[PDB]
Design an enzyme around this catalytic site. Sequence first.
Site, short mmCIF file in Angstrom:
data_model
loop_
_atom_site.label_atom_id
_atom_site.label_comp_id
_atom_site.label_asym_id
_atom_site.label_seq_id
_atom_site.Cartn_x
_atom_site.Cartn_y
_atom_site.Cartn_z
N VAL A 121 0.97 -1.33 -0.04
CA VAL A 121 -0.12 -0.15 -0.06
C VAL A 121 0.90 1.32 0.18
O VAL A 121 1.50 1.31 0.86
CB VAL A 121 -1.06 0.02 1.16
CG1 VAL A 121 -1.82 1.33 1.24
CG2 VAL A 121 -1.61 -0.96 1.11
N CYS A 122 0.80 2.18 -0.93
CA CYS A 122 1.32 3.27 -1.38
C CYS A 122 0.75 4.52 -0.45
O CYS A 122 -0.44 4.76 -0.95
CB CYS A 122 1.94 3.61 -2.48
SG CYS A 122 3.33 2.46 -3.13
#
Lengths: 989, 293
Positions: free
Chosen positions: B143-144
Amino acid sequence: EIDDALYSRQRYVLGDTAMQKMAKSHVFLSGMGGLGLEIAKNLVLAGIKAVTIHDTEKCQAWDLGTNFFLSEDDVVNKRNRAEAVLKHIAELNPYVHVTSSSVPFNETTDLSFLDKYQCVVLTEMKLPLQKKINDFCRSQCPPIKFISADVHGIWSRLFCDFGDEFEVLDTTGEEPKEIFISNITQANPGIVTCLENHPHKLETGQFLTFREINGMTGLNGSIQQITVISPFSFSIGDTTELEPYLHGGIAVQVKTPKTVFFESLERQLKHPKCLIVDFSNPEAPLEIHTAMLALDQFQEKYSRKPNVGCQQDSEELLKLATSISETLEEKPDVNADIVHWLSWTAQGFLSPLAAAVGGVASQEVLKAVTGKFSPLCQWLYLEAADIVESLGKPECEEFLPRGDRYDALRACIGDTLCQKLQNLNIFLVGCGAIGCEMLKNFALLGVGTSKEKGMITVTDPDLIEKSNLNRQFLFRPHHIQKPKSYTAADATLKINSQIKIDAHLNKVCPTTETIYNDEFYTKQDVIITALDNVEARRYVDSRCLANLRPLLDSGTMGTKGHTEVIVPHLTESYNSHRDPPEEEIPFSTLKSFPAAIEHTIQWARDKFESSFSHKPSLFNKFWQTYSSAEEVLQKIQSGHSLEGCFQVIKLLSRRPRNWSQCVELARLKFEKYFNHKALQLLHCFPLDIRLKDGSLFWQSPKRPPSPIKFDLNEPLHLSFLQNAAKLYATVYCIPFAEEDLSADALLNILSEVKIQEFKDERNAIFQLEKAILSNEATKSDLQMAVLSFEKDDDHNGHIDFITAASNLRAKMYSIEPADRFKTKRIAGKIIPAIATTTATVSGLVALEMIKVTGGYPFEAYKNCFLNLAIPIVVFTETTEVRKTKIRNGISFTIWDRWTVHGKEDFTLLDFINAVKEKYGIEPTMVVQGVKMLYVPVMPGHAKRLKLTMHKLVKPTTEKKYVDLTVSFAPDIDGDEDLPGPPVRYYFSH
Amino acid sequence: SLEEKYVAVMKKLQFDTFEMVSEDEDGKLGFKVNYHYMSQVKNANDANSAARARRLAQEAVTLSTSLPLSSSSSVFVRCDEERLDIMKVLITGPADTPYANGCFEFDVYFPQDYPSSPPLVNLETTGGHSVRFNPNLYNDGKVCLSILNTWHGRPEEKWNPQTSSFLQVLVSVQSLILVAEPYFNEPGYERSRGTPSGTQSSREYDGNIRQATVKWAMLEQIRNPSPCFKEVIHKHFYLKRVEIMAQCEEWIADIQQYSSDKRVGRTMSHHAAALKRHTAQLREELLKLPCPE
Ligand SMILES: O=P(O)(O)O[C@H]1[C@H](OP(=O)(O)O)[C@@H](OP(=O)(O)O)[C@H](OP(=O)(O)O)[C@@H](OP(=O)(O)O)[C@H]1OP(=O)(O)O
Ligand SMILES: Nc1ncnc2c1ncn2[C@@H]1O[C@H](COP(=O)(O)OP(=O)(O)OP(=O)(O)O)[C@@H](O)[C@H]1O
């Protein structure tokens, strides 16, 4: 050629040019005392072509306490000091041609023979003869570098003279930093707008070069001197005549030669330019210089050093110092204490100080023949006056020699402190370079040599490596692949037969705490760390905090080093430090938008990881979890989902069967990595797309890719193909031979291979049934060899593959490539190191150990941070303990622990009430480690209050007590819970 | 009334404790359910700072008190019964988005230096790493986000040990990752938002994400629910089953509207066929779903 397997870490510090200049350099060194021996050892470890050691005096029983190579046989046979160590010195490095000389030195001596050598170091020699020698050396064309180093008791002295004019080719040795440019102003003078954020951190007067600037094609490749305007701007010359500026820009710093000046020795004595090491006493070095000059004049006029405790000698020395001081240009005040202590310990000799000064002098010698760093200018006065200051006024009979090897140390620190040193149970962690030097210092100081008490415990699980012989002098080429701890213990016993050392092969970690229990730490008296990573340091510090034991920490990175002293109830701990978080490359930068060679190197490293370590492990785990591939097919046909089943079944279908298929796979991976990726990335983001601000999407720091078509004739392409093919063949367990790796054989293999043009359950089932039909499902097929990244072994091809992949990726992104050694350093995170810094920090840590053993007050302890590149040495007081208050005036420190006792029916509310009654504050939450025991807000815990301790924690019978952490409600609402000291609770009394 | 009932029932299950890790008599870590950060948990030292425990306890208080909950979207958190650093998060996709009414599972591990470093969050409903649900949600599960220091952003948008909280992380996930038009989350295409080509690309991305959501976020979550959230998943799907049918029918009609496009018509047809098959399977599963207790 330079054998990297032995000098890799030193090449990462000095570089190839410095190494080449070090070769063909002849160094003359006079005086084989302790200091001279240390200097010779450091130089011979460095790799000088030839070193000549010269000494005229014969061996004596007094020399055993200062020399870690002499033996009783040398004393019995009255051998020359230089000759008695010649054989042992050469063993440190066979590449060094070490020679001994014994020509007498005097005023009438023919001194013309020194012209052969290039750097002369003098030790334990009379001052007037030093004046004559320095007068001769600096008058030669080219000048001969002169360095004088001496140690008298606890006072040292260092001096350098590299001629009237000396040129250094690298001011600091730090790599240039790349700077991104945002705007250029066409004006007189021009103004540079730095890119958003990213301060340049430059200084006025430097030279900067620019490249990849759109618009000013004439400014690319030009060198311009800058004038700092702001942390994000500076001033350049005329740019009005140039074409306007669109966007983009890269600027890097250009190093320039620097010329420093030195004066003759006879002129420096009248107004020296000392180096300040303690800012609390800036005038101290001048006073030390005055005292030592008075000592030399006393030696001249009386032909002997002052006797210990003689009043007349002290008065004479004080009168001489007073007479000398008024003739100095600055007219300083004679320090009565410094002169008194110099008289008191004139005949003594301190080993750790000698080692530190030897390390510094060896670094200066390396600077002399290479010009790698800025040389010292022009004096250096290290001292350990804190050792004797706490002693008060000891009797002269305490310092008198007794006729043993420790006569030198006794004459410095008295008999009592020597005895307290011999009865130390000291635990040393790690046996690297710092560990070996510390063991040498222990042997010279006689730590733990008493029969009744005293024990040194050294633990290290690693094995000796070829590259470790360069920095760890206790090891030999025939000790390779042997345990470090055992070899060090055997070698140290040779230096001092009375030592008592226990060597363990165990690591230091929570999993091995069963042997290094609290009782073991209680038995110890001081813990010294020679580690190389931060997590082990934090674990050791936390272990020491729970037992209230002194800790000494040290660490060196190239030419930089630092020491820290931790004392119970006096100073802060290692965990008290809060370093800022380090910048890390984001996912977008690493995966798709690299900007520097480091990004491509890291991408190559983790690509190697994914290709040959992670995925083979997943393959093995998946196939060992489900033995029958037919069963897997049946489960798939029944709709059963499996973890990574598609990935593994895809791996099986592409499994190569022979060398030719491995070569084809290497070609396919090359095409996928460096042709398809760029094409698809440009397809996703066309080069000409614009953003709302009007800036191009491929603006800096983003760089547009470019496809690289395969060409076997290119050396880089062939290198990558060979390394990838070898790694795939090894992973998939197929044989190959050297002629199969030849260029012609590779050409004959892939010449017929078609290349795909750039553009799940059913496919998986089809592949699995085809494999089952083709009988590609044997137990050998369901297993795959896993490789580990062995950077040190050059024949496995790991470093070659990583370098080839990184260079290819850089060529794809128009970034200049990097050599093999830089890739080896960055990818393997090899920390640069050298012997001089480790020796210096070991000497300083030994001095701190003496201070800790003496039980001196807080003011005596000094933390040291040094960087020999500049060079700078800074001594600062260690951070004192901080009182932390919580409520009702109750305060605690990091060294405080609370104790409670319970019983069988002792419930949680009983424990909380007991703590509240004992300390006046109510605990609100109790946690052991990472296990919660009472959190009222959390559902399912309000009823936990009735629960007894034995049910709540469900403890083990190994221990009757568990260590807990507590917290208390804030005095003001809206604030976080107040911290609390750890509490140890016993299930019974 | 249905939304009020859904809020009332789901509130009791927003925060609870489950046994994810149990220690045997020897002292090793045994895992009862699948966990993404198993290796780091096994290598966690016992020299945990009391500050980390205090921060985790305060975060637990905040989670038990003020977790988001609504018909459009809800957050469910399960914490290990003996380790505060083990947590699983289930997020229901907000309405009017391609993720709508999809149950997405996350694994959150708190590092030893927490809150100095942001907690590690990894998506688990990746469909065996075959689906990239969002430009910020890679197929491998990473997850960015700026608040997790995994994305480019301002210092005030980065992780702050004193002010940033896990609840802020969850709210940021809900309000930034599961958006109405996920195609424009990419930092390059957002400058063509509203253009015809950008609209067509966004429609194609939405169709793909809708088919993936029906395939994984609900079908696999009802066929093989995780033990941690099983009751929550069953109750949620039973309560919203009619809305799921209406949403799937609307999605099928909308995607079939553009199946005649001359540029992306083939992809539209493929996505529509996959969506119809997934809708039939969802219909079967919901018909076979019993009434939860
Ligand atoms: O496992 P990774 O290290 O993340 O590398 C993968 C991998 O490529 P390699 O196996 O050649 O290293 C994928 O291929 P598969 O093994 O999954 O078939 C590929 O996927 P594509 O087949 O779709 O190219 C993907 O590339 P991408 O993420 O661009 O789709 C690429 O990722 P990286 O090379 O960027 O790590
Ligand atoms: N937890 C630990 N317990 C015990 N020894 C440790 C621990 N961590 C590291 N060490 C030891 O610390 C030493 C550090 O010394 P040094 O810097 O020479 O390391 P190295 O790995 O030999 O060097 P290089 O990285 O240059 O190859 C190593 O020999 C290593 O075995």
